[PDB]
Structure formats: structure tokens, C-alpha cells
Structure 1
Amino acid sequence: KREHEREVIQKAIEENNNFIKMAKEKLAQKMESNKENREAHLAAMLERLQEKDKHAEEVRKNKELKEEAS
């Protein structure tokens, strides 16, 4: 019976500690994966805007070509 009394209290510790452990790791994983997702959304947004600038440089150059071949 003393053997079981020690198994009960150790089971309670192992469960609370393991719960605290999992929650800590899952929260850090969520905050990290969120950071990655938000930064990816901004990176794609800026990539789209940059592709638009590259196109404006190509338009200004396309005018430079037409003016010289006039």
C-alpha cells in the first residue's frame, strides 16, 4: 500500500510537469510559426511591390528606346 501511495503522488507530479512541459513547447511553436507566417505575408507583399518597380524601370527604358529610334 505504501508502494501505491508513492506511485499516486509521483503520477500526479509526472502529469502536471508533463502538462506544463507540453504547453510551454506548443506555445513557443505557435508563436514561432505565427511569426513565420506573418513575415511571409509581408515578404510576398513586398515581392509583389518590387516586381511592380522592376516593371516601371522597364517602362521608362521602353520610352528611352522609342525616343532614340524616332
Structure 2
Amino acid sequence: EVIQKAIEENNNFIKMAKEKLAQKMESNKENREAHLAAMLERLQEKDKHAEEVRKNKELKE
């Protein structure tokens, strides 16, 4: 019982490590790209704005 417990706890420690690592890389890639998603979408309301100002300038005559 003792040696199969030393084995079981070494394995559960590897297990949880393996998982805590995988779960954090997934939360990180998500969070990082959401911030790049958020950053680019910000820049594109600037692109869409840079035209409503240019198109507005044609609406004169």
C-alpha cells in the first residue's frame, strides 16, 4: 500500500502540474489575443471614421 501510494502521489502531482500549466497557457493565449482583438477593432473604428470624414467632405456642392 505504501509504495503504491508514493507512486500515486508522484503521479497526481505530475497530473495537476500538467493541467495547471495547460489551463494557464489557454487562459493566456485567449486573454492576449482578446487584447489584440480589442486593439485592432479600435484602430478600425478609426479607419471607418477616417472615411465618414472624407465622405462628408464630398457632401458639399
**TM-score exceeds 0.5:** yes
Q: In the alignment, which residue of structure 1 is the partner of 2:46? A: 52
Q: Deviation of residue 37 (structure 1)?
A: 0.6
Q: Deviation of residue 11 (structure 1)?
A: 0.8
Q: In the alignment, which residue of structure 1 is the partner of 2:33? A: 39
Question: How far apart in 2 are the matches of 1:17 and 1:40?
Answer: 35
Unaligned runs of 5+ in 2: none
- Aligned identity (percent) is 98
Q: Deviation of residue 32 (structure 1)?
A: 1.2
- Higher radius of gyration, 1 or 2: 1
* CA distances 1:13-45 after superposition (whole Å, capped 9, x unpaired): 110001101100110111111011111100000
Unaligned runs of 5+ in 1: 1-6
Question: How far apart in 1 are the matches of 2:22 and 2:43?
Answer: 32
CA RMSD, Structure 1 to Structure 2 (Å): 0.7
Question: How far apart in 1 are the matches of 2:10 and 2:55?
Answer: 67
Question: How far apart in 2 are the matches of 1:51 and 1:26?
Answer: 38
Q: Deviation of residue 56 (structure 1)?
A: 0.7
Instruction: Show structure 1 runs of 4+ deviating over 6 A.
Output: none
